[model samples]
Target: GFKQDIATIRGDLRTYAQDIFLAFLNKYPDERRYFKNYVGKSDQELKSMAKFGDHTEKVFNLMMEVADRATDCVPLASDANTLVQMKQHSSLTTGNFEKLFVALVEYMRASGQSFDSQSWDRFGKNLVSALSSAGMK
Candidate 1:
C-alpha cells in the first residue's frame, strides 16, 4: 500500500521534486547555501536549470528506490554511496535530511495525497538510520 502510494506520487516526479525543494527551502532558507550552484538563482530560474532538473531527478529517484526497499529496512549500497558523496560535498546534516523528508511528507499531505502515517514513520526511521550509517552527523 505504501509502495503503491509512493508510486502514484512519483508519477509527477518533476512537479513533486520542485515543490518539495521549494517547500524545504522556504522553511529553511539558510540551507540554500548548500545548493551552491543554485544559490543566487530565483526559484523560477532554479527550476529551469538543467542541473537542477538532474539533481532533482536523482533525489526523487532515490526516494523511489528507498520506498521500493522500505520493507527490507536497509539502504542500498549505491544509495549509501550517493548519500556519502552528498554529505562530503555539501553542508547538509542528518537533521537537514530529516527535515527534507518532513517537507516531502508535508507536501504530499497538502497536495491531498493519502498515505499511511505509520508506514511513513517507518520509512523516515529507516532513512535516518541510513543517514547515520552513512556517517552523516
Candidate 2:
C-alpha cells in the first residue's frame, strides 16, 4: 500500500515537486557559481551562509529537468532503489549520458548529427530504465 498510496497522491506530489524545484532555482539565481564560493570556505564560513548550489549553476528547475526526466518526470524515488542507480548515480554525469553516449550514437547512426525527438525519447528510455517502478507498466 505504500506504492498505491504514493501513486494515488502523485498528482499533488508532482505539482509540489515542480513548484519546489522552481522555487529552489529562483532562490539561487546562479547556484553553480555560487557553490564555488563554499568550496574552500571554512566550516564557520559554511555556517554563515544559506541555501545550496548545483551543476552549471543551474536552478532547481534545470536540476529537476534532469532529475524529473531521469525519474520519468513523475515520481521522486531515491536512486538507491534501482533504475537510476544502475549507474551508481541518478544525477548528472556530464555529457556522458546525453551527449557523448546515447545522443551521439543515435545521431551518427540514425541521422548524421541531426537528431529527432525519438533520440531524446530513447535517451530518456535508457536512462529511465535504470529506475524501477512504473505506475502503468
Candidate 3:
C-alpha cells in the first residue's frame, strides 16, 4: 500500500504515456498520425520515422535542462561557458577533481575582526570563513 500513489503516477505519467504511444505506433499506421501529432511534430519525416519512440525530443530537452542546471554550479572560465581552468595539484588521487579550501582567515586575523560561533559547528565554520572572505556562501 503506497501512501502517495497519485503523486507517483502523476510524476511517471509522461514516460508511461510515451511508452503507450510507441506501442500504439508499432501496432497501427492509422494511429501514427495521432501519436505523431500528440508528440508535437509537424515534420513528416520524423513523424514517419518515429525515431526515439515519440517522446525522445521532450526527453532530450528535459535532459538538457537537467544538465544545464546541474552544471550551473560548475566553475566557469570567462563567459560561464567553460569550466574553470583546472590544474592537477596532486598526483595521488585517481579522479581529476580537486578540492581547495581557502578563506578570509589571513585577512580577518590581520584586520582584527570579531567573528561569531555557529551551532552547526562544521557547516557554520564554512559559512563563517566564507563571510569573512569573498565568494559563494
Candidate 4:
C-alpha cells in the first residue's frame, strides 16, 4: 500500500534527483572536490551537467525499482547490496543516507505529491537498514 503510493510519484523523480545531487554536493564541499571531473561548478550547473544526470538516473531509478519491489524484501535487500558492491556509492559513505532521506521528503513536498510522511520516513529508514543488513556499512 505504501509502496504503491510512492509509485504514483515515480514521474517526479527525474527533477527531484537533480535537486538531491546539487543539494548533496553543495552541502558537502569536500565531497564535491572528490569528484575530479566536477572539481568546480555551481549547484545549478551540476544539475544540468551530463555526468551528474547520468549517475542520478542510474542510482535513483534503481532505488525506485528496489522500493517498488519491497514486497519481496530479500530481493530488495540483495539488490541494494549489489548496487553498493558495484561501487554505485563510491563517493559517499552509507552515512549519506541521512541527507538522502531528508532530500526525498523535501522532494515530495516540493513536488506537491500527497505523500504519507510517516510511511515515507519509515520506508526510507527501512531501506538503509536493509542495505546495512546486506553488508553495506
Candidate 5:
C-alpha cells in the first residue's frame, strides 16, 4: 500500500524533498525565480538550505497526505489536492512540472528504495490530469 511504502522511508522525506528541489534547480534554473518570493529565503539561504526546503516540506507533506488517501481514490484525492497546491505556483509550466516529477522519481531511485512501476504509472497519469485541470497546458 502507499501508506506502508511511504512509512518505510518516512524519516527521509525532508532530505528527499531537498534533493528534489536541487534537482529541479539543476534541470530548470529559471524555475528558481518562481520560488524566490514564495520560499521566504535568500538566494544564499536557498543554496545552503537546498532551495526552499521549507516549501518543499510543505509540498512533500501534502503529497504524503494525498498518498494516505490515495488507496481508495488515487487520482481523485491526489489530483484535487494537488491542483489546490499548484494554485499558488503560477510559474509552474508543463515543462517545469515534468522536471519536478522526474526529479522525485530519480530521488527515490537514488535513495535505493524499491520502486513501484505500477504506482508511478498511476501517479504520472494523475499528475497529468491535475496539470490539465489546473490549465497548465
Candidate 6:
C-alpha cells in the first residue's frame, strides 16, 4: 500500500519534489538558512535555479527510497550515511527533518494526492528515528 502510494507520486516526481520543497520552505522559513546558495532569492527565482531543482530531486529521491521501505522502515546504511552527512554539513536538526515530513504530508493532502495516512506516519517516524540514530540532533 505504501509502495503503491509512492508509485503514484513518482509518476509526477519532479513537480511534486519541487512543490514539496517549496512548501517546506514556505512553512518553515528559518530552515532556509541551510540553503545558503539561494540566500536572498525569491521563491520564483529559487524555482528557476538548476541547483535548487537538483537539490530538491536528490532529497525527494531519498524520501521515495525511504517510503518504498516503509513496511520494514529501516534505513539502509547509505541512507543513514546521507542523513549523517546532511546533519554534519548543514547542522540540520532531527526536529527540522521531522517537520519536513509533516510539511510533505500536508502538501500532498493540499494538492489532492492520494496516500495512506498510516503509511506516511510510519515512514515519517522511521525516517526521524533513522536520522537520530545516525547522530542528528
lDDT of 6 by residue, 1-137 (tens): 67777887788777778888889888988888877887798878988998888888887787788666545655565675676786335567778878788897787667665677566766788878887787777
lDDT for 110 (candidate 5): 71
Q: Pick the candidate with the highest TM-score.
A: 6
lDDT of 1 by residue, 1-137 (tens): 57677777689887777778888887778878777787778889888888887888778777778678656445565575577676344566678777777776777667765766456666777777787787767
Instruction: Work out how many backbone clashes candidate 5 has.
Output: 0
lDDT of 3 by residue, 1-137 (tens): 11132233235545433443344344443444433345545344444655544465454243223223332222212311222112211222211111111121222223332322121123224333332232222
Q: Give the TM-scores of the predictions, in the order they appear.
A: 0.80, 0.21, 0.22, 0.75, 0.70, 0.84
What do the candidate models score in CA lDDT, each in turn?
0.73, 0.37, 0.31, 0.67, 0.63, 0.76
* Ranking of all predicted structures according to TM-score, beginning with the best and ending with the worst: 6, 1, 4, 5, 3, 2
87 Cα displacement, candidate 5 (Å): 4.3
Q: What's the lDDT for candidate 6?
A: 0.76
- Model 5 alpha-carbon miss at residue 93, Å: 3.4
Clashing pairs in 6: none
Q: Using lDDT as the measure, what is the rank order of every candidate, best first? A: 6, 1, 4, 5, 2, 3
TM-score of 5: 0.70
Model 1: per-residue Cα lDDT at residue 13: 81
The parts of candidate 1 lying over 4 Å away from their true place are 72-78, 85-91
lDDT per residue as tens, model 5, 1-137: 45565675457777766666777676666676775553555445664664366777777777666666665325564466456455586545566666776766666557666765346546756766666675676
Q: Which candidate, 2 or 6, would have the higher lDDT against the true structure?
A: 6
RMSD of every candidate to native, in Å, equals 2.6, 16.8, 21.3, 3.0, 4.0, 2.2
Return the TM-score for candidate 4, rounded to 2 decimals. 0.75
